[PDB]
Design an enzyme around this catalytic site. Sequence first.
Site, PDB file in Angstrom:
ATOM      1  N   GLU A  35       0.796  -1.215   0.000  1.00  0.00           N
ATOM      2  CA  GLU A  35       0.000   0.000   0.000  1.00  0.00           C
ATOM      3  C   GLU A  35       0.839   1.280   0.000  1.00  0.00           C
ATOM      4  O   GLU A  35       0.595   2.188  -0.798  1.00  0.00           O
ATOM      5  CB  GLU A  35      -0.963   0.044   1.189  1.00  0.00           C
ATOM      6  CG  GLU A  35      -2.177  -0.890   1.120  1.00  0.00           C
ATOM      7  CD  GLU A  35      -3.150  -0.600  -0.032  1.00  0.00           C
ATOM      8  OE1 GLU A  35      -3.128   0.502  -0.622  1.00  0.00           O
ATOM      9  OE2 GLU A  35      -3.958  -1.497  -0.348  1.00  0.00           O
ATOM     10  N   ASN A  46      -6.887  10.071  -6.383  1.00  0.00           N
ATOM     11  CA  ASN A  46      -7.663   9.315  -7.357  1.00  0.00           C
ATOM     12  C   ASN A  46      -8.499  10.310  -8.148  1.00  0.00           C
ATOM     13  O   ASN A  46      -9.590  10.682  -7.736  1.00  0.00           O
ATOM     14  CB  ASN A  46      -8.578   8.338  -6.635  1.00  0.00           C
ATOM     15  CG  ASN A  46      -7.808   7.354  -5.792  1.00  0.00           C
ATOM     16  OD1 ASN A  46      -7.078   6.505  -6.322  1.00  0.00           O
ATOM     17  ND2 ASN A  46      -7.940   7.466  -4.472  1.00  0.00           N
ATOM     18  N   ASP A  49     -12.490   9.712  -8.912  1.00  0.00           N
ATOM     19  CA  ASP A  49     -13.579   9.984  -7.996  1.00  0.00           C
ATOM     20  C   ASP A  49     -13.245  11.071  -6.995  1.00  0.00           C
ATOM     21  O   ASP A  49     -13.987  11.287  -6.039  1.00  0.00           O
ATOM     22  CB  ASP A  49     -14.058   8.703  -7.312  1.00  0.00           C
ATOM     23  CG  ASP A  49     -13.124   8.223  -6.212  1.00  0.00           C
ATOM     24  OD1 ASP A  49     -11.941   8.606  -6.176  1.00  0.00           O
ATOM     25  OD2 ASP A  49     -13.598   7.450  -5.373  1.00  0.00           O
ATOM     26  N   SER A  51     -10.980  11.315  -4.635  1.00  0.00           N
ATOM     27  CA  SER A  51     -10.709  10.948  -3.254  1.00  0.00           C
ATOM     28  C   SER A  51      -9.195  10.767  -3.137  1.00  0.00           C
ATOM     29  O   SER A  51      -8.491  10.689  -4.149  1.00  0.00           O
ATOM     30  CB  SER A  51     -11.453   9.656  -2.895  1.00  0.00           C
ATOM     31  OG  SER A  51     -10.943   8.571  -3.645  1.00  0.00           O
ATOM     32  N   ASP A  53      -6.046   8.595  -0.841  1.00  0.00           N
ATOM     33  CA  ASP A  53      -5.699   7.522   0.096  1.00  0.00           C
ATOM     34  C   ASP A  53      -4.562   8.076   0.928  1.00  0.00           C
ATOM     35  O   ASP A  53      -3.584   8.560   0.374  1.00  0.00           O
ATOM     36  CB  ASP A  53      -5.223   6.273  -0.651  1.00  0.00           C
ATOM     37  CG  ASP A  53      -6.274   5.719  -1.584  1.00  0.00           C
ATOM     38  OD1 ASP A  53      -7.452   5.657  -1.182  1.00  0.00           O
ATOM     39  OD2 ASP A  53      -5.913   5.365  -2.725  1.00  0.00           O
ATOM     40  N   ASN A  60      -8.889   5.567   2.400  1.00  0.00           N
ATOM     41  CA  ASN A  60      -9.552   6.439   1.439  1.00  0.00           C
ATOM     42  C   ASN A  60     -10.444   7.469   2.133  1.00  0.00           C
ATOM     43  O   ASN A  60     -11.292   7.127   2.967  1.00  0.00           O
ATOM     44  CB  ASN A  60     -10.355   5.595   0.455  1.00  0.00           C
ATOM     45  CG  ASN A  60     -10.924   6.415  -0.667  1.00  0.00           C
ATOM     46  OD1 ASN A  60     -12.064   6.858  -0.602  1.00  0.00           O
ATOM     47  ND2 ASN A  60     -10.129   6.638  -1.692  1.00  0.00           N
TER      48      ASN A  60
END
Length: 130
Positions: A35, A46, A49, A51, A53, A60
């Site tokens: 990750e 991202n 959308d 968002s 992380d 998220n």
Amino acid sequence: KVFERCELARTLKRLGMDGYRGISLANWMCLAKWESGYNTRATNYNAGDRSTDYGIFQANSRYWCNDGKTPGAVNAAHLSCSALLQDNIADAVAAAKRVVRDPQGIRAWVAWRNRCQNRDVRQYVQGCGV
């Protein structure tokens, strides 16, 4: 902070992650590795959308932490996303624990399915004294 392998393993163990909801420490290590590469400041936007992380387990902002700029977002772990960029990973761990209390468990992270599920993850904790 970019953790060294065994340093992280012990940190997670002390934070109560070994066997939390049936998830071994080696699985958490494999997850953190893929990750964020164990980087507490890791962030990934991202565009699709809108968002982001955050942190070592890449929570998220659309569902787990609040950063104020994510459309139609919720804050399930009830934390500021800033809390997930600290060197101290206690809050990121609490958020990761919150995620797995849901039915999917560790499967909530797609990266886990792709590179940790049904794999030999012994190498993540070997020699760490955990």
